[PDB]
DNA sequence: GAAGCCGGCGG
DNA sequence: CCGCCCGGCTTC
């Protein structure tokens, strides 16, 4: 298995700088607002230089960067920018998995006919192409599975090319900090250190069960496989980006004859923004009181709009027995788990 | 089942 | 830092 993982450096920042080149060499800050207060989406080199970073409240960011340019975020254009890039990658890969707007996994095992060095060069070729074609720097990871490829990518930022070779893989498994693992955050590392575990290997000397009592099987076991180099878990042809449209109603209601004519339209601005076939739909409804009542059914394959309008209709109506007192302010749909062709 | 907590992650 | 968040595990 050869996976190249692609990560877009400070994408939103980069897109803006590409669109408005006079922003370059000068602090730029992309901002995000609630339903209110605003925070930093991303920030460019110079903004980051001064200490800005995601989540930072815009007041705070101004405290340390008054010379900065604060723009509102434009998801759609960054999405158009993302999709162009995902397509480039697509041509390069046997299977592509679009993890997010700025992340994709690529199985290329076949493309380079199993040759890991040609894997790395393909990975070089990809970096150079995105820069040449879109003026954007990404960070690649090349490794014999998804999880490793992400890890080595994050180890290689900014504008990196990380590498774990099947032939060398065990030395990397030997020096990996437990905290550097996806799924292991601030709390879990803090607790996992307590037995004497900061390297991945450490677990193998420590008994099995107690670890679950700190992790939960599904992760405790997922650590065990990584340590042993038994995690495979293929790269699937699916997009993980959720597409979802809402529509506020003329008045709060419960009359299905009123809300269907708003459900339909919410799906059209979504089941069209599909590019594939969703294994998941979620009917989402906001009440008079801002509270949220969301139900959704999983499909073996996907679901077309062929089944959609009634999957959504009964999914609303099931929420109309689950809540019986309250009215609906706003109605939404979310399509994710998209299978690609 | 389905609310709710906990913990991780990214706009 | 917290969400038309998220999933996973616990609990009525
Ligand atoms: Ca990112």
DSSP assignment of A233-278 equals -PPPSEE---EEEEEEEEEEE--HHHHHHHHHHHHHTTSSS-SSEE
Report the C-alpha gap between A104 and A8 in whole angstroms.
9
Burial A310-329 (b: 16+ CB within 10 A, else e): ebbbebbeebbeeeeeeebb
The reply to whether the CB atom of residue A99 sits less than 7 A from any atom in nucleic acid chain B is no
- Residue A26: both structure tokens together: 């000068």
Helices A116-134 & A75-92 angle (0-180, nearest 10): 140
Q: What is the DSSP letter of A44?
A: -
Report the C-alpha gap between A23 and A13 in whole angstroms.
10
The reply to whether the CB atom of residue A189 sits less than 7 A from any atom in nucleic acid chain B is yes
Closest to A106 in 3D by CA, of A81, A119, A128, A78 = A119
The label of the residue with tokens 């405290």 reads: A63
Report CA Rg, chain A: 23
How many Å separate Cα A274 from the centre of its chain? Answer: 16
Q: Nucleic chain C: which protein residues 39-58 of A have CB below 7 A from it?
A: 39, 54-55, 57
Is the four-CA dihedral A264, A267, A272, A275 of positive or negative sign?
negative
- Residue A133: both structure tokens together: 């074609």
Residue nearest to nucleotide B10 (CA to C1'): A54
Contact A5, A119 (CB under 8 A): no
Report the C-alpha gap between A2 and A180 in whole angstroms.
21
Report the C-alpha gap between A109 and A93 in whole angstroms.
9
Question: Which three-class secondary structure state does DSSP give residue A41?
Answer: strand
- Residue A175: both structure tokens together: 């020096």
Nucleotide nearest to A323 (CA to C1'): B2
DSSP assignment of A177-229 equals BGGGSTT--HHHHHHHGGGT-SBSGGGGTS-SHHHHHHH-HHHHHHHHHHHHT
A240 CA to centre of ligand 1 in angstroms: 14
For chain A, domains (ranges, CATH) are 2-10+75-163 (3.30.70.270), 11-74 (3.40.1170.60), 164-230 (1.10.150.20), 241-338 (3.30.1490.100)
Helices A75-92 & A11-19 angle (0-180, nearest 10): 100
Question: Which three-class secondary structure state does DSSP give residue A156?
Answer: coil
For residue A64, what are the CA distances in angstroms to A20, A244, A288?
23, 36, 40
Active-site residue set of A: 103
Contact A16, A23 (CB under 8 A): yes
Q: Give the determination technique.
A: X-ray
Contact A6, A237 (CB under 8 A): no
A248 CA to centre of ligand 1 in angstroms: 31
The reply to whether the CB atom of residue A186 sits less than 7 A from any atom in nucleic acid chain B is yes
Q: What is the DSSP letter of A22?
A: G
The helix, strand and coil proportions of chain A, stated in percent and rounded to the nearest 5, come to: 40, 25, 35
Contact A55, A39 (CB under 8 A): yes
Contact A237, A97 (CB under 8 A): yes
Contact A48, A17 (CB under 8 A): no
Q: What is the DSSP letter of A155?
A: T
Report the C-alpha gap between A217 and A238 in whole angstroms.
26
The reply to whether the CB atom of residue A34 sits less than 7 A from any atom in nucleic acid chain C is yes
Report the C-alpha gap between A162 and A142 in whole angstroms.
6
Residues 6+ apart with CB under 8 A from A133: A88
A79: left (phi over 0), alpha (psi -120 to 50) or beta: alpha
Q: What is the DSSP letter of A161?
A: E
Residue nearest to nucleotide C6 (CA to C1'): A242
A142 CA to centre of ligand 1 in angstroms: 17
Preceding peptide of A20 cis, ω within 30°: no
Experimental resolution (Å): 2.7
């Amino acid at each position: 298995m050869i996976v190249i993982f692609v990560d877009f450096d400070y994408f939103f920042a980069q897109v803006e700088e590409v669109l408005n080149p006079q922003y370059k060499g000068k602090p730029l800050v992309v901002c995000v607002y609630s339903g209110t207060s605003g925070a930093v989406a991303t920030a460019n080199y110079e903004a980051r230089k001064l200490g800005v970073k995601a989540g930072m409240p815009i007041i705070k960011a101004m405290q340390i960067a008054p010379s900065a340019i604060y723009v509102p975020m434009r998801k759609p254009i960054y999405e158009a920018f993302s999709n162009r890039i995902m397509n480039l990658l697509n041509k390069h890969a046997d299977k592509i998995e679009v993890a997010s707007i700025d992340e994709a996994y690529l199985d290329v095992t076949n493309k380079v006919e199993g040759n890991f060095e040609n894997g790395i060069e393909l990975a070089r070729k990809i970096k150079q192409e995105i820069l040449e074609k879109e003026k954007i720097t990404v960070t690649v990871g090349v490794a014999p599975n998804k999880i490793l490829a992400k890890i080595i990518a994050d180890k290689s930022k900014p504008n990196g090319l990380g590498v774990i070779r099947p032939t060398e893989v065990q030395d990397f498994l030997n020096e990996l900090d437990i905290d550097e693992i996806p799924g292991i955050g601030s709390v879990l590392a803090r607790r996992l250190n307590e037995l004497g575990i900061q390297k991945l290997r450490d677990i193998l000397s420590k008994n099995y069960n107690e670890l679950e009592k700190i992790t939960g099987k599904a992760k405790a076991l997922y650590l065990l496989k990584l340590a042993q180099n038994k995690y495979s878990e293929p790269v699937e042809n699916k997009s993980k980006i959720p597409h979802g449209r809402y529509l506020t109603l003329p008045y709060n209601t419960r009359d299905v004859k009123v809300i269907l004519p708003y459900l339909k339209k919410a799906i059209n601005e979504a089941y069209n923004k599909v590019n594939g076939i969703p294994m998941r739909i979620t009917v989402i409804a906001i009440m008079e009181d801002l509270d949220i009542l969301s139900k959704g059914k999983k499909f073996k394959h996907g679901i077309s709009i062929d089944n959609a309008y009634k999957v959504a209709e009964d999914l609303l109506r099931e929420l109309l027995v689950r809540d019986k007192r309250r009215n609906v302010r706003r109605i939404g749909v979310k399509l994710d788990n998209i299978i690609i062709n």
